[PDB]
Amino acid sequence: IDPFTMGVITSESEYVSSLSAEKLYRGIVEDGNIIYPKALPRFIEKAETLEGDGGPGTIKKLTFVGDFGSTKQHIDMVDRENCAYTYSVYEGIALSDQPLEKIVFEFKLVPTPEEGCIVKSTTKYYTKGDDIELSKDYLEAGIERFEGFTKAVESFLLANPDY
Amino acid sequence: IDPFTMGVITSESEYVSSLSAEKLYRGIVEDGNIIYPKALPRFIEKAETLEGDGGPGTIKKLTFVGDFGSTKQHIDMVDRENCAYTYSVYEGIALSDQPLEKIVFEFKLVPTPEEGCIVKSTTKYYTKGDDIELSKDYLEAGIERFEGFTKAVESFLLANPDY
Ligand SMILES: C/C(=C\CNc1ncnc2[nH]cnc12)CO
Ligand SMILES: C/C(=C\CNc1ncnc2[nH]cnc12)CO
Ligand code: NA
Ligand code: NA
Ligand code: NA
Ligand code: NA
């Protein structure tokens, strides 16, 4: 009479970077705490590690510039060899008319022959409740924001090879 | 031996709109609750009035798309005749190394002969503490965000004369 229901809504976006997979990956994953505020000086005030050594299970916190609060990232998968990174957000993620259980952010960087890379981004929204309503603008906002972080880092690193 | 100290840091920006002062003012001030999400579908989820009839003393709340929280605006001055609007934000405004007492946002729209208007924006940061440290990127972030709201509304209204 009463099923358990869950939706998983996946959005995929790609773009081609002229920066190498290795460099972009290091920028975001290893050196993020320094690079995020430098790349996004008007959006990210601070990026810090609250728990863990940087591997799976690590908890990071981004604090945003202005009255936009802060958010924790819970690191799931860290694969330097394959330039792959996954983390989850658990809090402050509800819409007005759709609660969410979590949002998962995944990127994979794939080298191209030109020695740039394809940046493969994914966002996955996991729904809470017995039904589902998610708008195009929302679903787009999330993957654009995420891909926009990566793009900002790429631009900073091209501009500043030593940081 | 111990003074009371406060800083008031004022940032002023202008730009010229092709939309009339009257129309832009109505869009933001009178019709904001409908227009903000329509103009900024990927940033503002909802804009609502919590208390008051829209005049001075009114409290509005913007809810942001994604994990960026929400913020209350406390309406101070509402002058339709002069297309002027002022409100304050009190919460979620600290920097990591500088508490703030409040941020005041003011705009004045001045008709030009072309029947567009000059949009005069001001942000005022009121400091909390016995000393002061505020960076250029921060001070810029605030007035750019604010002027960016107004610009988004201007673009939506030019594109949609009936909403
Ligand atoms: C980025 C910063 C402020 C921007 N926030 C706002 N800017 C303009 N209007 C508002 N209403 C509520 N919050 C805002 C830094 O102070
Ligand atoms: C606009 C939306 C999400 C964007 N937020 C994030 N996007 C990418 N990485 C993150 N880390 C913490 N929060 C984020 C809507 O889900
Ligand atoms: Na902040
Ligand atoms: Na948050
Ligand atoms: Na469910
Ligand atoms: Na939100």
Ligand code: NA
């Ligand atoms: Na807020």
Ligand code: NA
């Ligand atoms: Na003081």
